[PDB]
Design a protein around this ligand. Structure first.
Ligand SMILES: C[C@H](Oc1cccc2ccccc12)C(=O)Nc1ccc2oc(-c3ccncc3)nc2c1
Ligand SMILES: C[C@H](Oc1cccc2ccccc12)C(=O)Nc1ccc2oc(-c3ccncc3)nc2c1
Ligand SMILES: C[C@H](Oc1cccc2ccccc12)C(=O)Nc1ccc2oc(-c3ccncc3)nc2c1
Ligand SMILES: C[C@H](Oc1cccc2ccccc12)C(=O)Nc1ccc2oc(-c3ccncc3)nc2c1
Ligand SMILES: O=c1[nH]cnc2c1ncn2[C@@H]1O[C@H](COP(=O)(O)O)[C@@H](O)[C@H]1O
Ligand SMILES: O=c1[nH]cnc2c1ncn2[C@@H]1O[C@H](COP(=O)(O)O)[C@@H](O)[C@H]1O
Ligand SMILES: O=c1[nH]cnc2c1ncn2[C@@H]1O[C@H](COP(=O)(O)O)[C@@H](O)[C@H]1O
Ligand SMILES: O=c1[nH]cnc2c1ncn2[C@@H]1O[C@H](COP(=O)(O)O)[C@@H](O)[C@H]1O
Lengths: 336, 335, 336, 335
């Protein structure tokens, strides 16, 4: 019974547990490169992806993101025709990159075919639990039919799950169980891995195969994004930080003379029903209207450039490979 | 001086200290089995027991629990005759399982004979301190007279105490010193053991004998329940989470339009008064009314099923044996 | 430079860091013994001492404490005649034990002589910093003149300081730098030792010589007292928990229809001036009126009896020698 | 892959993490020496420097500091001619010590020549990132032209950076990346080092060369200052604690009867605007007016004297070399 003895051995770190250590630098924030290659046909100018959620990304959001040099994932809480047309809407807007989310269902192959005929640039096969035979089988199935299509699969949190996805044929792994700002998985199911540990463990494995990972969830400030990249992610995915912006879908409601938008987990009661007996693992809330996406992105990327300047990272490869962290106690959060 | 040198060596974890790690799964939440076997004559469809507290479980609660696949323990803050008819009332509802609390007093044997006569399915011999000669001796005496009766004995929080209860004749051990929501033991006495550490330590001992443990107390969320089962408990006992439901004893009070219900420790001033020099070790508060028990159980089991889904646990045995935790700092509890 | 390398090696625990582990018990709370022998002529029925502070202990408080089986220390913020008469007042109240505080000053010997002529039962030579040549010299001086007098010296926090006091001739060591509820030493001077660590370290050393220690400061609940005893103290000293009671000196003022009493550190601005260029290391505040001392004591002792019942301690010697602690994280404070 | 494996090994402590341990003392607080020598031509009576920030130090502040036995750094958010007359104003007040901030720009040498001409006692070459080729090269060039001028260079937070600044010619190193009260670096960039760990790491390197360090930032209480000196700094620099005093630049604002003063990071939007594409790394707030500098210094030095009293430190060298800390948990910060 080795599993009995190992039950409490693992330790995990999240964003707040840690800081990046400054090192010798020859490169100003304005002159560092923030480009990343997820694959030969998916090269991003900035390492940011907007979440495939129904209160985050439709055509308008994905267009704005692609123009900033990033990528948007069109969500799956709409019919096949609606999504294929959302993708097409982005592609016709001047050779912009776009991705699209698909559930591991019977109709997945149908949906994917329409998305591919619409010339999608990457499909996202993500469930709440990526380390499942369902996901593995679907990825194998899609890979066999579409040898050249970019497949992002997730979400996972372990090296073991990362290996299973890579061998099933995914060329990008999305990492994150439990860190979402709208996520209640930790409270409902008692399940999760602190996000910095998950990213580093998954990346350790992925690097062996030259596969990139996406850090998905829990990024609350630009500094967290720099941390997530330095822990080994090629790119980060944001929900909450993008939900307040003009280009995100949803009405801008006014309560108390303050403009707000609705942001909700895809595992919330409302979302789960638009996606048609599980217990909800997400909540529904309001975020402040942030204005146009461009302002949020320039602030994020600016945070990252400053981070890279301190680390002496000329490019993101250096950051992933060489940046060092120092660990602090909870009292170390107050000092900041 | 060996004991002097080891005073501060031990470390313990509570629920908020850890998360379960996802693992290879091929079983959906709806497909998983949540059945649990405590003995060959006490088999539960869901791993949930309602606390034997005078504001949590009487016959109505025990009936609603048995129907959902769990078990209620009829509290002992009432006469022998009152307790025996409560038990018989539950059994009247069509062979439902029911348990009954018994204190450790010279009274105890009389009460138990009445509960056996009324067909209890299990007796709970529990005191604040399970690792005491009094409790040991009473279990010995009860086992001698009733070879086949299910005896649950607690509360304990160490392997050493678990072993003692098992050797006396308890076939189920109840674990938890200090974790309860209404418990002031750790403030008044300075005594307690972090509940995941206690469950795991007692499980480690009890497994050697094939004896199940109950994780008793401290469970606020359904995730905490999944953590308790994964740390080695067969089943959990809840007071707080059940106290506001319609089936629990007690009047629904209305303050400022809001329906409340009173919940108190059995070591509170009020409870100790009803059950008759010790300083109180429990408080008395109000919890929100929550409607029918069924709605509360369904969310709990749902949370558990999601948990087993992420773990690949096709049943509770896999969960106890295989699930792995990861530990985090307090700053990691904020996400 | 060994001291450079060792600068950050020590770890310390306070009350909240820890819990007592239940063990096999044959003894009910009502039948355990809480008596302690500090010396052949100073035997206490309950292990409690009230602080020698000007808002805590005068004759009335020391009388009430002695009758409960404990001990009160008459404070030194009064003239010699006033204190000698305060002591006498206690002794004439029917053979009650009493102690008296003295500062390490030139006039210390004068004050002590009057206290001894008044038949004091123990003098307390405590300063803010007991590990000082001033305190050592005074203790030697008093021991040489009064071979039989009980001398409690403090306050100290290390094994080294405990050894220095014991060898200078103190027969009881009072432990505590920084844990006081009214103490700002930690914020003003950056100086302190977490109280459980200090008690255990000091006791480890004192046991070698058969000398008892007093845990002084930081006890906020009865459980902390059980912890302090289990960490090796013979007895505990309380300030704040006794300052609200009827027998404590000071006016009972009413603000908002609520009765309050004034409690202040002896290093506070107000106290330091009644004791006649240092920076204040204590504050001044209000505590709720608690009624008669008897109620507070019965609650404290009750907490301790319950603690002993859980530990299976028939007497305090067992608790000191055998009780085991388990350490918890800060999240472990919430569970309680 | 060695760097990959060591990503998470390092641990760091801040002020709230530790306390100083009392030790054998025979020296009273009034008897202790708080004098500190930075170089043979910059000797301070008290180990305190006011920050070179446009809401902390101009000539009035620098004069009041020099009189108390410390030093002020004239900030650089003003023209060369303005800075040189500020410096000359302080020197006019009877040979008081004064320092001046200089940015790392092509401008820098011109400004420094004007400051040298005005008789500065020390120049502070400091940027957000001290461990940069730009800063190294500028110190090299300044040392070459001015062999005997005191050069303070920062900010840094590693032994490696400390060594680099020393080899370039800095004779004093300023330490602190992220600890400041108005600093948002750790949130915007994710970058920083816990201030006691940084000071100690840089001290460890600098001692090998007999070079002093300044602990810059994060000091809220006088105890924090004692901790910084004991972790190996010769002296501390304060912004926050000095910003509300009468001598600091800035108008006293009155809101709801309460006198406030504005305090902002030099990397705030407002400061960056006055000092002329980077994202802001500092905030702008108000601190309470605190009256004369003298009252603030007296409490600080008093706190320090008590600290050295408990430590047995008859002087600052003993404190750096001998004082021992003890580490505590966050629950131990609550007492
Ligand atoms: C209802 C809940 O919803 C979500 C949870 C977390 C992230 C979400 C992101 C987007 C949309 C919904 C999300 C859920 O899917 N829970 C859940 C729990 C355990 C599961 O285990 C499996 C599973 C296990 C083995 N094979 C296939 C699926 N699916 C599961 C779904
Ligand atoms: C008043 C307090 O009540 C409770 C405390 C904790 C959990 C409770 C759960 C249900 C009902 C009451 C509870 C108590 O029994 N305190 C207490 C403390 C120490 C004791 O030690 C012994 C004991 C020790 C040795 N032999 C027999 C009994 N009984 C004790 C009772
Ligand atoms: C003003 C401050 O007051 C107190 C601090 C802490 C506990 C108190 C309890 C009762 C009354 C006053 C207290 C103090 O005494 N500070 C202080 C700080 C360092 C000292 O170091 C020495 C000292 C060192 C070496 N020899 C003799 C005395 N006395 C000191 C006094
Ligand atoms: C805008 C920000 O301002 C400050 C940040 C932190 C401390 C401050 C103290 C005083 C005044 C301004 C401060 C900044 O300079 N950010 C920043 C971030 C990274 C950098 O990296 C480099 C750099 C790297 C390599 N060579 C030259 C410069 N300059 C940088 C500036
Ligand atoms: O309801 C849900 N429960 C748990 N996680 C969710 C849910 N919906 C979306 N997520 C995840 O949370 C991420 C967004 O996290 P955020 O950037 O911190 O708001 C998404 O990209 C998903 O990976
Ligand atoms: O007053 C008491 N003091 C300490 N523990 C108690 C008291 N009353 C009940 N308990 C325990 O706490 C459990 C319920 O805890 P809860 O589910 O966290 O509210 C019960 O099953 C008992 O084991
Ligand atoms: O002003 C002071 N500064 C620091 N400690 C003090 C001061 N006055 C009294 N003390 C200590 O604090 C103890 C009281 O702590 P309490 O029981 O937690 O309130 C006293 O017995 C003294 O040891
Ligand atoms: O805007 C800024 N961002 C980060 N650090 C700053 C900024 N402005 C000043 N500092 C640093 O913070 C120190 C003052 O910190 P304080 O004493 O904690 O308020 C200064 O001496 C600078 O080293």
């Amino acid at each position: 019974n080795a599993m009995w003895e190992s039950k409490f051995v693992k330790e995990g770190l999240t964003f707040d547990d840690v800081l990046l250590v400054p090192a010798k630098s020859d490169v100003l924030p304005r002159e560092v490169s923030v480009k990343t290659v997820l694959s030969e046909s998916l090269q991003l100018n900035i390492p940011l992806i907007s979440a495939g959620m129904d209160t985050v990304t439709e055509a308008d959001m994905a267009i704005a993101m692609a123009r900033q040099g990033g990528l948007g994932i069109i969500h799956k809480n709409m019919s096949i025709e609606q999504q294929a047309e959302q993708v097409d809407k982005v592609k016709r807007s001047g050779g912009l990159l776009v991705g699209a989310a698909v559930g591991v269902t019977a109709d997945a192959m149908t949906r994917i075919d329409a998305l591919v005929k619409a010339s999608v640039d990457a499909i996202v096969l993500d469930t709440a639990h990526g380390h499942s035979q369902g996901v593995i089988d679907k990825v194998k199935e899609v890979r066999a039919k579409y040898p050249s299509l970019n497949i992002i699969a997730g979400n996972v949190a372990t090296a073991e799950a990362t290996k299973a996805l890579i061998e099933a044929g995914a060329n990008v792994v999305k990492v994150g169980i439990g860190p979402g700002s709208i996520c209640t998985t930790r409270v409902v199911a008692g399940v999760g891995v602190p996000q910095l540990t998950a990213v580093y463990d998954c990346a350790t494995e992925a690097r062996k195969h030259g596969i990139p990972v996406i850090a998905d969830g829990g990024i609350k400030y630009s500094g967290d994004m720099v941390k997530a990249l330095a822990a080994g992610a090629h790119v980060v995915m944001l929900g909450s930080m993008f939900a307040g912006v003009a280009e995100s879908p949803g009405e801008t409601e006014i309560y108390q003379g303050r403009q707000f938008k609705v942001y909700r987990g895809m595992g919330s009661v409302g979302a789960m029903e638009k996606g048609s007996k599980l217990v909800p693992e997400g909540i529904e809330g309001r975020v402040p209207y942030k204005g146009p996406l461009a302002d949020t992105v320039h602030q994020l990327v600016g945070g990252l450039r400053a981070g890279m300047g301190y680390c002496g990272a000329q490019d993101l490869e250096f950051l992933r490979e060489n940046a060092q962290f120092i660990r602090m106690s909870g009292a170390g959060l107050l000092e900041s």
